[PDB]
Amino acid sequence: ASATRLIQGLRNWASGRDLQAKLQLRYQEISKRTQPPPKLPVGPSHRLSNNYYCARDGRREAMPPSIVMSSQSEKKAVSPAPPIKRWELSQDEPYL
Amino acid sequence: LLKKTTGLVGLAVCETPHERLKILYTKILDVLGHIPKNAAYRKYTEQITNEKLSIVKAEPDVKKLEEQLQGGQIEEVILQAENELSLARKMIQWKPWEPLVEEPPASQWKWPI
Amino acid sequence: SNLIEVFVDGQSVMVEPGTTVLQACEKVGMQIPRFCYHERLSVAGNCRMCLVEIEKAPKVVAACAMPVMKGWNILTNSEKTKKAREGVMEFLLANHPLDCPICDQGGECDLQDQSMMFGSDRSRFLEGKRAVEDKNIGPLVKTIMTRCIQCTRCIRFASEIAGVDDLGTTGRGNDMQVGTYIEKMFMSELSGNIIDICPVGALTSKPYAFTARPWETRKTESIDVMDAVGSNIVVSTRTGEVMRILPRMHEDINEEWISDKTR
Amino acid sequence: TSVKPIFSRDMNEAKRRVRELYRAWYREVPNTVHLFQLDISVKQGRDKVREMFKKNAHVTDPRVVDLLVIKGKMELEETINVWKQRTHVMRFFHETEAPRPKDFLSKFYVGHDP
Amino acid sequence: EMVRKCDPHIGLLHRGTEKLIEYKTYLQALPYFDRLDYVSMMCNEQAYSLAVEKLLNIQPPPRAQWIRVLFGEITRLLNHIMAVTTHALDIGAMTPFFWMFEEREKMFEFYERVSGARMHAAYVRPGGVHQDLPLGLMDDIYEFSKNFSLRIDELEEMLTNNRIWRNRTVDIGVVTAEDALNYGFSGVMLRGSGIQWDLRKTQPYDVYDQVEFDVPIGSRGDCYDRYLCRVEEMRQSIRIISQCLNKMPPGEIKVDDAKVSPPKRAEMKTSMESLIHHFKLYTEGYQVPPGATYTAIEAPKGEFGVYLVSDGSSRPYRCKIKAPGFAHLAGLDKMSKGHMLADVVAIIGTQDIVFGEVDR
Amino acid sequence: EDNKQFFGRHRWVIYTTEMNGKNTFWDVDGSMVPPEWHRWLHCMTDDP
Amino acid sequence: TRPTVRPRNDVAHKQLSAFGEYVAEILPKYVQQVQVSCFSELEICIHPDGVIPVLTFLRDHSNAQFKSLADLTAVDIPTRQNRFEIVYNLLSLRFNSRIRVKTYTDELTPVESSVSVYKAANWYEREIWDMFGVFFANHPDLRRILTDYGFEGHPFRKDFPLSGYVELRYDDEVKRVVAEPVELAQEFRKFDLNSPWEAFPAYRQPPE
Amino acid sequence: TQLITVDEKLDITTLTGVPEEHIKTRKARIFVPARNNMQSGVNNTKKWKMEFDTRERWENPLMGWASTADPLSNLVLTFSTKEDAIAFAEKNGWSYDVEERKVPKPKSKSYGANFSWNKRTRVSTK
Amino acid sequence: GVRTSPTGEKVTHTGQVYDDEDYRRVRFVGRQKEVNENFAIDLIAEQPVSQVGSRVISCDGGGGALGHPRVYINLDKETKTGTCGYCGLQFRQQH
Amino acid sequence: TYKYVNLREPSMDMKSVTDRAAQTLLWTELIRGLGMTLSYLFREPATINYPFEKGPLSPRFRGEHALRRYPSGEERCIACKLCEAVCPAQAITIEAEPRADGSRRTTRYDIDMTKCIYCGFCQEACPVDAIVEGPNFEFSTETHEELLYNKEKLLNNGDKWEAEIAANIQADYLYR
Ligand SMILES: CCCCCCCCCCCCCCCCCC(=O)OC[C@H](COP(=O)(O)OCCN)OC(=O)CCCCCCCCCCCCCCCCC
Ligand code: SF4
Ligand code: SF4
Ligand code: SF4
Ligand code: SF4
Ligand code: FES
Ligand SMILES: [K+]
Ligand SMILES: [Zn+2]
């Protein structure tokens, strides 16, 4: 930032870019090192009523794997999912 | 319209894709007729090969054939037909429609122990 | 045989008449949570942690005390069984002191473990907790009675197994306290076993106090030599030093108790 | 009792593979002492080869001795190709290790081990 | 001059990581993932966290997912700066190394402001993230993102149209698409060959279905198109970072199951249940229900996956770590046939290889 | 301070020439900074 | 169960169950179990004779096209008489899906090498030789990949200790890095962490 | 055929890389661990464990840490049955000894027995 | 509240000091034995006992969330003061 | 949703062919790269003057460990061994006993700083804010055992650094 305008013009010409609009060295624009004290929100389970743990027990709703075939018609052939949809070329910048 | 590139490296553009797919699908059905009828691999592969061969016989356009075979480029559809042919030739020699070669031990797939 | 058929979650089990609900659930490998029930003490039924739904019954039953009738389907994991367990754990933890770091029972606490397994993850108690005066019952049992949850395993051990009749409850309601009511010293030959069965850290070992912690201890199974009873023990060590001696359950010797010299 | 083999149907083919592996190690040892420039003799390295073969001489299972021949060929392949350094070749010769007490009495003197 | 055979001997950083995971709890085994792909720390944290959360049947809160995607793309910038600049440093272009490691240093300051460590943060945890963003962090991430496109522009000014750089990369390490699928390649190693596959599109995780970005697809399979794919993934990562900064929601940052994520210290010091849960999560740890998952993310080196096996206890029964560098360095011998000795260093460059994730 | 310098140059210390008996004229040391200035110098706070 | 519970994906669960039936009835010679987890992953537990017929099928069938080997793994479970569990993780880019092919072996039974199906496996099962001692027959170059060159034993077996049996130090007498029987200045402190209470009643095993 | 018949006893001691000192001098102990009497839960008494005999732990001269020379000091193996543990100990050449599983015997409980008319099993307090 | 053994070695707040015939003092030869000289058992005994008018008092150590977990101390015994189990601050019912 | 890097077919008219030939023979992109390097020659460098100028940190920073005290002189550590239970590298060794006034206090609090992975799980496991991982990173040694901290060294680090540690905790405890 402390560079003179001759060196700044030489530098912008040699790079081909405006280098003062986007400095890679940081100055007063960055955040303060001392901040106001935060006040963080609490989650949806901070309720005094209708908040039983069994109605939101994630780990105890996990079941053992459903054994589909165990060794102790004209049914359609299946795939593990539908086939993947073809990706669309970018409208933003396809390089085309 | 003569597609210039498939986009995939090493996968060259097929000049006549419909004739190649017809030859590959009829050759798959030729190999696949040598499998017993109670083998589910024969029934499922005859079913999907007849679907693909009917779609190839019912579409002159290459792009629309790509959109309704639903397998990407037409050359990787050709490659998957060749892969299915090689698989059927291997499945003849494996004979995997047979019963289970051996039961597992009693707690072989019991998790947790 | 005159075995009656009952159901634990639909699974049929043939039980002897007089068997409680908790033992019938034990027979299928389910362990109903408990604080006042102990299989070598008399049935108390006063912590209400074992409340379980019998289906087609609009009231949970104390499984430690209720005998099974023929044809019951014990729902050990239904929704109102779990609501009962969370409610009872909430009341057990309402007045309980935040002493888990400075408590010798931490890591091996029944109250901590089945708070984790059967109760809620948080608190609704926005009040002040009670604080109980400590007692002095000897050089073996450190007594911090704020941690007491009034399960009366003290009293049933001292009355029924040690045969002493010095422990009891004084007061009434939330002010009810466990102790001897006087400066009396509970020195039996079996006095340290009340350290074992107290589910909380209200009764702890005064020699073992603060020195170790259960997860870091190694558990060597071994034999008492202080008498010719041959009590089975756990010598729990830590980094090559003997930390304490616990009992092993052996039904034919020392059922799960040891003497104070052994301990 | 009917198991799947690895290379050998029985102990005869297995002993044949053991015998070919001993031949290959015996041929390799002077090249190993030369190119690693070891401070041992060819007699001493061949005695270490014989010691490593006679350590496993009690085995009567064809699959176990198949895997022992496989691991010996892996050791030899890592020695012919210079993949081991001098340190990995000389780890067979426990030179910096103090001799262990062998009788009851000196094991009683030095500590608690049986 | 020609390379007939390339035999990469590895294990020089095999440290037995995933046997050491078998004796430690899930929280305790989290910081091993910082040190596998040790330029892609929070991405491996995210992969392990998603594995554990998939086995736990819980989900992070939305703000945790947005923070994870934000720092995953900051991490992607870190790894592609390391990749491009050391790939150029080994060839000989030593100068954009130094030019880009100041932006790299500022992103390490972002890590240190959010966690306290410059590299191994242990910040993305199963349940969410460990701690909320400090006040003023997102403004500085905006001030970084506002300027980072010019840094990519001057990197690309040095290397891309340079004829010496093109002569080191244009016909080097050409991989066909079928061989790249057969050798188990992933990431740029697929997408340089024209394979339209990115896990943040196809099998999307935390909020990547809600951010909008493009996927750079190569056309020749060489070192040069993989270079251009990594430069354009820096571009698209800046795009995702802008969308994450604008769409960051309020709310909590851990899952509000105190049997999985530890409670706040204000309620740990006040509530009995929270002190019990704090105790048991920091001594025993939470129990994971028994099962084996394979959870994979699109790390900046490729598909980074965990095959994680729980037996019910609070410690993993097994934790296999699928890393992209293992398959890429297995494909090194095919990719270097018919090339030269100074081309093998470009092939070990274009395969972004970090031997912590190769050797574990 | 010099807030016109870029962030990293904007705060510095000129170490003493003698600390705890040691001649620190040429032997300056990063651990010579007391902890009350160590927040300010390492930019943990805005406040000296 | 909205905020904190992982939402169940029923469509993928149904599709993976149907495809698991499909694989189990195309290949009854080898498929022993088919299961789908609650987080919707398909496991095909097969006999070890069918490593090549199953994995080629999934690589080459037009409704499978699992053209990618993501990961190959062994798991040592010592209470099983076939203590090693070989786990293949496959990716179909066409059908956007993952499958898991699990099989078994012990120390002496060789598994057939899957390098002819997926070349990706060339190092992976080589790692399974180095870490577990599972031999792979018809492997191109089977040797150690991660352990040191003189290493004895297989480290990721669960009867193998955390530290080894030997450790290295430089010895100035022989001017050489040497291996000696391991001594630790501080023993690794074993923590018994498991709670004596049941955590997941859905996973309760029946008693004896 | 493609199968051979091996009637020999299963032994893999030459293949596991274990030094002979930690094969023929160690005593494996196969046991169900006793319930911790600090607690009433039984979820740790479900499985079989193979441990080894403890060796010397000494004081580190620098810090006082517990130094060991035993590699098998922290090795606890878990088995579903007793026979799996015995087969695994015999497979590895470890001389073992087996304790039997000690279950608690079925108790006879009655809440009404606390209030008997004539028996000693009355409670004097509640 | 440090003191010194007859060997001239400082005794820690734990009470650790090496014996005279212990060789391990040789580690401090030419160097120093580092002890902390602020013994906490002497510093907490300098705190005055807090007179309160209630029967049960709460203690969190001061600082709110910066202290220890808030515990509740009973003060019914007039023989003994009631000590915080974490911080060691002691309390007395003034009646 | 994707883009094609390097799929430009270059123009073959005499203008563009002469442009590419002038680039080949007259080295235009090489002068472009020289110009970018020359443009960095006249920028101010990013080099701070260590030891006199320090790298920026935050109050979350995880440096040298310290045991803290209450604002009465009593040490906060009540020997609960949560820090050594959560310690992913097992750097912490703790032995405890009741001291002469019956308080639950440690007699051994060792941290091996050469096992420590500096992840700060100990200071978030700690329920009384006793162990912290403070702000010091400039504590390199000439000897390995000078990084094997005992309780005396950690308490001295706490007494040394408390004026900074307490203000960092004051800055950050609302995020915890
Ligand atoms: C009878 C009496 C004479 C006996 C024979 C002596 C012959 C002459 C030798 C040179 C004079 C002796 C002193 C040498 C230096 C000792 C003092 C020293 O190092 O002071 C430290 C000071 C810088 O402090 P420092 O701590 O290093 O900096 C930290 C960063 N702030 O360091 C400095 O300020 C710089 C020190 C520079 C050293 C001297 C200059 C270089 C050597 C010149 C002579 C040799 C040249 C040979 C040809 C070289 C190739 C052309
Ligand atoms: S008795 Fe249990 S719940 Fe109560 S303070 Fe002690 S460890 Fe915590
Ligand atoms: S002190 Fe313990 S055993 Fe006695 S009544 Fe209270 S909780 Fe029960
Ligand atoms: S920072 Fe981590 S590794 Fe270091 S002592 Fe604390 S918990 Fe252990
Ligand atoms: S430092 Fe904290 S966590 Fe560690 S033992 Fe002391 S009080 Fe407990
Ligand atoms: S256990 Fe039945 S009520 Fe206490
Ligand atoms: K107790
Ligand atoms: Zn207090």
Coordinates of C-alpha atoms in Angstrom, one line a residue, chain E:
Chain E
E1 CA 16.1 -42.5 -21.4
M2 CA 13.0 -44.7 -21.4
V3 CA 11.3 -46.1 -18.4
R4 CA 10.6 -49.8 -18.7
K5 CA 9.5 -50.6 -15.2
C6 CA 8.7 -48.4 -12.2
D7 CA 8.4 -50.3 -8.9
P8 CA 7.4 -48.0 -6.1
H9 CA 8.4 -49.3 -2.7
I10 CA 6.3 -47.7 0.1
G11 CA 5.8 -48.2 3.8
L12 CA 8.3 -45.6 4.7
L13 CA 5.5 -43.8 6.6
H14 CA 3.4 -46.8 7.5
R15 CA 2.8 -46.1 11.2
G16 CA 0.1 -48.6 11.9
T17 CA -2.6 -46.0 12.1
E18 CA -5.6 -48.1 11.8
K19 CA -4.5 -50.7 14.3
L20 CA -4.0 -47.8 16.8
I21 CA -7.6 -46.8 15.9
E22 CA -8.7 -50.2 17.2
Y23 CA -7.7 -49.3 20.8
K24 CA -9.1 -45.8 20.9
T25 CA -12.6 -44.4 21.1
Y26 CA -14.3 -42.6 18.2
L27 CA -13.4 -39.2 19.5
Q28 CA -9.9 -40.4 20.3
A29 CA -9.5 -41.9 16.8
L30 CA -10.7 -38.7 15.0
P31 CA -7.2 -37.0 15.0
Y32 CA -5.6 -39.8 13.2
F33 CA -7.5 -38.6 10.1
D34 CA -5.9 -35.2 10.3
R35 CA -2.6 -37.0 9.7
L36 CA -3.4 -39.3 6.8
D37 CA -3.9 -36.9 4.0
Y38 CA -2.0 -34.3 6.0
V39 CA -2.7 -31.5 3.6
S40 CA -6.5 -32.2 3.5
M41 CA -7.2 -32.4 7.3
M42 CA -10.8 -31.3 7.7
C43 CA -11.9 -33.3 4.7
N44 CA -10.7 -36.5 6.3
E45 CA -12.3 -35.4 9.5
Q46 CA -15.5 -35.0 7.5
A47 CA -15.2 -38.4 6.0
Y48 CA -14.7 -40.1 9.4
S49 CA -17.4 -38.0 10.9
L50 CA -19.9 -38.9 8.2
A51 CA -19.0 -42.6 8.7
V52 CA -19.6 -42.5 12.4
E53 CA -22.8 -40.4 12.1
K54 CA -24.1 -42.9 9.5
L55 CA -23.5 -45.7 11.9
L56 CA -25.0 -43.6 14.8
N57 CA -28.3 -42.8 13.0
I58 CA -27.9 -39.1 13.8
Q59 CA -27.3 -36.1 11.7
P60 CA -25.5 -32.8 12.2
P61 CA -27.4 -29.5 12.5
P62 CA -27.6 -27.4 9.3
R63 CA -25.1 -24.8 10.4
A64 CA -22.6 -27.6 11.1
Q65 CA -23.1 -28.9 7.6
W66 CA -22.5 -25.5 6.1
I67 CA -19.4 -25.0 8.2
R68 CA -18.1 -28.4 7.1
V69 CA -18.7 -27.6 3.5
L70 CA -17.1 -24.1 3.9
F71 CA -14.0 -25.5 5.5
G72 CA -14.0 -28.5 3.1
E73 CA -13.6 -26.1 0.3
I74 CA -11.0 -24.0 2.1
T75 CA -9.2 -27.3 2.6
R76 CA -9.7 -28.1 -1.1
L77 CA -7.9 -24.8 -1.9
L78 CA -5.1 -25.8 0.5
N79 CA -4.6 -29.1 -1.1
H80 CA -4.7 -27.8 -4.7
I81 CA -2.3 -25.1 -3.8
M82 CA 0.0 -27.8 -2.4
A83 CA -0.6 -30.0 -5.4
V84 CA -0.1 -27.5 -8.2
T85 CA 2.8 -25.6 -6.6
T86 CA 4.8 -28.7 -5.5
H87 CA 4.1 -30.3 -8.9
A88 CA 5.6 -27.2 -10.4
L89 CA 8.4 -27.0 -7.8
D90 CA 9.6 -30.5 -8.7
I91 CA 9.6 -29.7 -12.4
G92 CA 11.4 -26.5 -11.7
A93 CA 8.9 -23.7 -11.4
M94 CA 9.9 -22.7 -7.9
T95 CA 8.3 -19.3 -7.8
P96 CA 4.5 -19.8 -7.7
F97 CA 5.2 -22.1 -4.8
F98 CA 6.2 -19.1 -2.7
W99 CA 3.5 -16.9 -4.3
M100 CA 0.7 -19.3 -3.3
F101 CA 2.0 -20.2 0.2
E102 CA 1.1 -16.8 1.6
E103 CA -2.6 -17.5 0.7
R104 CA -2.0 -20.9 2.1
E105 CA -0.7 -19.3 5.3
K106 CA -3.8 -17.1 5.6
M107 CA -6.0 -20.2 5.3
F108 CA -4.0 -21.8 8.0
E109 CA -4.8 -18.7 10.0
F110 CA -8.5 -19.5 9.3
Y111 CA -8.0 -23.0 10.7
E112 CA -6.2 -21.6 13.7
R113 CA -8.9 -19.1 14.4
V114 CA -11.6 -21.7 14.2
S115 CA -9.9 -24.5 16.2
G116 CA -6.6 -23.4 17.7
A117 CA -4.3 -25.4 15.4
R118 CA -2.9 -24.3 12.1
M119 CA -3.0 -27.8 10.5
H120 CA -4.6 -30.6 12.6
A121 CA -7.7 -29.0 13.9
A122 CA -9.7 -31.9 15.2
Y123 CA -12.6 -29.5 14.5
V124 CA -15.0 -31.6 12.4
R125 CA -16.3 -34.2 14.7
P126 CA -19.1 -36.9 14.6
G127 CA -22.1 -34.9 15.5
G128 CA -21.1 -31.6 13.8
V129 CA -18.2 -29.3 14.5
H130 CA -16.5 -28.9 17.9
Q131 CA -17.0 -25.2 18.3
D132 CA -18.8 -22.3 16.6
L133 CA -17.2 -19.8 14.3
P134 CA -15.6 -16.9 16.2
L135 CA -17.0 -13.5 15.4
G136 CA -15.4 -11.8 12.5
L137 CA -14.1 -15.0 10.8
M138 CA -16.5 -15.1 7.9
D139 CA -15.7 -11.5 7.0
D140 CA -12.0 -12.4 6.7
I141 CA -12.9 -15.5 4.7
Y142 CA -14.7 -13.1 2.4
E143 CA -11.7 -10.8 2.3
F144 CA -9.6 -13.8 1.3
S145 CA -12.1 -15.1 -1.3
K146 CA -12.4 -11.6 -2.9
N147 CA -8.7 -11.7 -3.7
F148 CA -7.9 -15.3 -4.3
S149 CA -9.0 -15.4 -8.0
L150 CA -6.2 -13.0 -8.9
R151 CA -3.8 -15.4 -7.2
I152 CA -5.1 -18.2 -9.3
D153 CA -4.8 -15.9 -12.3
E154 CA -1.2 -15.1 -11.8
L155 CA -0.4 -18.8 -11.1
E156 CA -2.2 -19.6 -14.3
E157 CA -0.3 -16.7 -16.0
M158 CA 3.0 -18.4 -15.0
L159 CA 2.3 -22.0 -15.8
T160 CA -0.6 -22.6 -18.2
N161 CA 0.3 -20.9 -21.5
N162 CA 4.1 -21.5 -20.8
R163 CA 5.6 -23.7 -23.5
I164 CA 8.1 -25.3 -21.1
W165 CA 5.3 -26.3 -18.7
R166 CA 3.2 -27.7 -21.6
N167 CA 6.2 -29.7 -22.9
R168 CA 6.5 -31.3 -19.4
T169 CA 2.8 -32.2 -19.2
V170 CA 0.9 -32.5 -22.6
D171 CA 1.6 -36.1 -23.6
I172 CA 2.7 -37.3 -20.2
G173 CA 0.8 -39.8 -18.0
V174 CA -2.1 -40.3 -20.4
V175 CA -4.7 -42.6 -18.8
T176 CA -7.6 -44.0 -20.7
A177 CA -11.0 -43.9 -19.1
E178 CA -11.4 -47.6 -18.9
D179 CA -8.0 -48.1 -17.3
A180 CA -8.7 -45.3 -14.9
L181 CA -11.9 -47.1 -13.8
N182 CA -10.2 -50.5 -13.8
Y183 CA -7.3 -49.3 -11.7
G184 CA -9.6 -47.8 -9.1
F185 CA -8.6 -44.2 -9.8
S186 CA -10.8 -41.4 -8.4
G187 CA -11.2 -37.6 -8.5
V188 CA -9.1 -35.7 -11.0
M189 CA -7.5 -38.9 -12.1
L190 CA -10.9 -39.9 -13.5
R191 CA -12.0 -36.5 -14.6
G192 CA -8.9 -35.8 -16.5
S193 CA -9.8 -38.7 -18.8
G194 CA -13.3 -37.3 -19.5
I195 CA -15.1 -39.3 -16.9
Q196 CA -18.0 -37.2 -15.6
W197 CA -17.8 -38.3 -12.0
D198 CA -17.7 -36.2 -8.8
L199 CA -19.0 -37.5 -5.5
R200 CA -20.3 -34.1 -4.5
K201 CA -22.7 -34.3 -7.4
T202 CA -23.5 -38.0 -7.7
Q203 CA -23.5 -39.2 -4.1
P204 CA -23.9 -35.8 -2.4
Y205 CA -23.2 -35.2 1.3
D206 CA -23.7 -32.5 3.8
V207 CA -25.1 -29.5 1.8
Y208 CA -23.4 -30.1 -1.5
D209 CA -26.9 -30.6 -3.0
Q210 CA -27.6 -27.0 -2.1
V211 CA -24.4 -25.3 -3.4
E212 CA -24.0 -24.7 -7.1
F213 CA -20.8 -25.5 -8.9
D214 CA -19.3 -26.8 -12.1
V215 CA -17.0 -29.8 -12.5
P216 CA -13.9 -29.5 -14.7
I217 CA -13.7 -32.4 -17.2
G218 CA -10.4 -33.1 -19.0
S219 CA -10.2 -34.3 -22.6
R220 CA -6.8 -36.0 -23.0
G221 CA -6.0 -37.7 -19.7
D222 CA -2.6 -36.2 -19.5
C223 CA -0.7 -34.3 -16.8
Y224 CA -1.8 -31.0 -18.3
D225 CA -5.5 -31.5 -18.2
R226 CA -5.3 -32.8 -14.6
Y227 CA -3.4 -29.5 -13.9
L228 CA -6.2 -27.5 -15.5
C229 CA -8.8 -29.5 -13.6
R230 CA -7.1 -28.7 -10.3
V231 CA -6.9 -25.0 -11.2
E232 CA -10.5 -24.9 -12.2
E233 CA -11.4 -26.8 -9.0
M234 CA -9.8 -23.9 -7.1
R235 CA -12.0 -21.6 -9.2
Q236 CA -15.1 -23.6 -8.3
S237 CA -14.1 -23.9 -4.7
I238 CA -14.1 -20.1 -4.5
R239 CA -17.6 -20.3 -6.0
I240 CA -18.7 -22.7 -3.3
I241 CA -17.1 -20.6 -0.6
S242 CA -19.1 -17.6 -1.7
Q243 CA -22.3 -19.6 -1.7
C244 CA -21.4 -20.9 1.8
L245 CA -20.7 -17.5 3.2
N246 CA -24.0 -16.1 1.9
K247 CA -26.1 -19.0 2.9
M248 CA -24.7 -19.8 6.3
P249 CA -27.7 -20.4 8.6
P250 CA -28.0 -19.7 12.4
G251 CA -28.3 -22.4 15.0
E252 CA -26.3 -24.9 16.9
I253 CA -23.1 -26.6 15.6
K254 CA -23.2 -30.0 17.4
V255 CA -26.0 -32.4 17.3
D256 CA -28.2 -31.8 20.3
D257 CA -28.0 -35.4 21.4
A258 CA -25.9 -35.1 24.5
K259 CA -25.3 -38.8 24.4
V260 CA -23.3 -38.3 21.2
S261 CA -22.0 -34.7 21.3
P262 CA -20.8 -33.2 24.6
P263 CA -22.9 -30.6 26.2
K264 CA -21.8 -27.0 26.7
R265 CA -19.5 -26.3 29.7
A266 CA -22.0 -23.8 31.2
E267 CA -24.6 -26.6 31.5
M268 CA -22.0 -29.2 32.3
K269 CA -21.2 -27.1 35.4
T270 CA -24.9 -26.6 36.2
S271 CA -27.0 -29.7 35.2
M272 CA -26.6 -33.2 36.6
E273 CA -27.4 -35.0 33.4
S274 CA -25.0 -32.8 31.4
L275 CA -22.2 -33.5 33.8
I276 CA -22.9 -37.3 33.6
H277 CA -23.0 -37.1 29.8
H278 CA -19.8 -35.0 29.7
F279 CA -18.1 -37.5 32.0
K280 CA -19.1 -40.6 30.0
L281 CA -18.4 -39.0 26.6
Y282 CA -14.9 -38.0 27.6
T283 CA -14.0 -41.2 29.4
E284 CA -15.9 -44.1 27.8
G285 CA -17.2 -42.4 24.7
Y286 CA -20.5 -43.0 23.0
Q287 CA -21.4 -46.5 21.9
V288 CA -21.9 -46.9 18.2
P289 CA -24.5 -49.5 17.1
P290 CA -22.9 -52.6 15.6
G291 CA -22.4 -52.5 11.9
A292 CA -20.0 -51.9 9.0
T293 CA -20.3 -48.8 6.8
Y294 CA -18.4 -47.7 3.8
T295 CA -18.6 -43.9 3.7
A296 CA -16.7 -42.0 1.1
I297 CA -16.3 -38.3 0.2
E298 CA -14.8 -36.4 -2.7
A299 CA -11.6 -35.4 -1.0
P300 CA -9.3 -33.1 -3.1
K301 CA -7.2 -36.2 -4.0
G302 CA -10.2 -38.3 -4.9
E303 CA -12.6 -40.7 -3.3
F304 CA -11.5 -40.9 0.4
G305 CA -13.5 -43.6 2.1
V306 CA -13.7 -45.3 5.5
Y307 CA -14.9 -48.9 5.9
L308 CA -15.8 -48.6 9.6
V309 CA -16.8 -51.6 11.7
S310 CA -18.4 -51.2 15.1
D311 CA -19.2 -54.1 17.4
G312 CA -21.4 -52.1 19.8
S313 CA -18.7 -50.8 22.0
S314 CA -17.3 -47.2 22.2
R315 CA -14.2 -48.2 20.2
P316 CA -14.1 -49.3 16.5
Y317 CA -13.7 -52.9 15.8
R318 CA -12.1 -52.1 12.4
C319 CA -11.3 -48.9 10.5
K320 CA -10.1 -49.5 7.0
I321 CA -9.0 -46.2 5.3
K322 CA -9.5 -46.1 1.5
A323 CA -7.2 -43.3 0.2
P324 CA -6.8 -42.2 -3.4
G325 CA -3.0 -42.2 -3.4
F326 CA -2.9 -45.9 -2.9
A327 CA -4.6 -46.7 -6.2
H328 CA -2.9 -43.8 -8.0
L329 CA 0.5 -45.0 -6.9
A330 CA -0.4 -48.5 -7.9
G331 CA -1.2 -47.0 -11.4
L332 CA 2.1 -45.2 -11.4
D333 CA 3.8 -48.1 -13.2
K334 CA 1.3 -48.2 -16.0
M335 CA 1.3 -44.4 -16.4
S336 CA 5.1 -44.2 -16.7
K337 CA 5.6 -46.8 -19.4
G338 CA 7.2 -45.3 -22.5
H339 CA 8.1 -42.1 -20.7
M340 CA 11.4 -40.7 -19.4
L341 CA 13.0 -40.3 -16.0
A342 CA 12.0 -36.6 -15.7
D343 CA 8.5 -37.6 -16.7
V344 CA 8.1 -39.9 -13.7
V345 CA 8.4 -36.9 -11.4
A346 CA 5.6 -35.2 -13.4
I347 CA 3.5 -38.3 -13.0
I348 CA 4.1 -38.5 -9.3
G349 CA 3.1 -34.9 -9.3
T350 CA -0.1 -35.2 -11.3
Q351 CA -1.2 -38.0 -9.0
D352 CA -1.5 -36.0 -5.9
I353 CA 0.4 -38.4 -3.6
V354 CA 0.8 -37.8 0.1
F355 CA 2.4 -40.9 1.7
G356 CA 0.6 -40.5 5.0
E357 CA -2.6 -41.6 3.3
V358 CA -0.7 -44.0 1.1
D359 CA 1.0 -45.9 3.9
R360 CA -1.3 -45.2 6.9

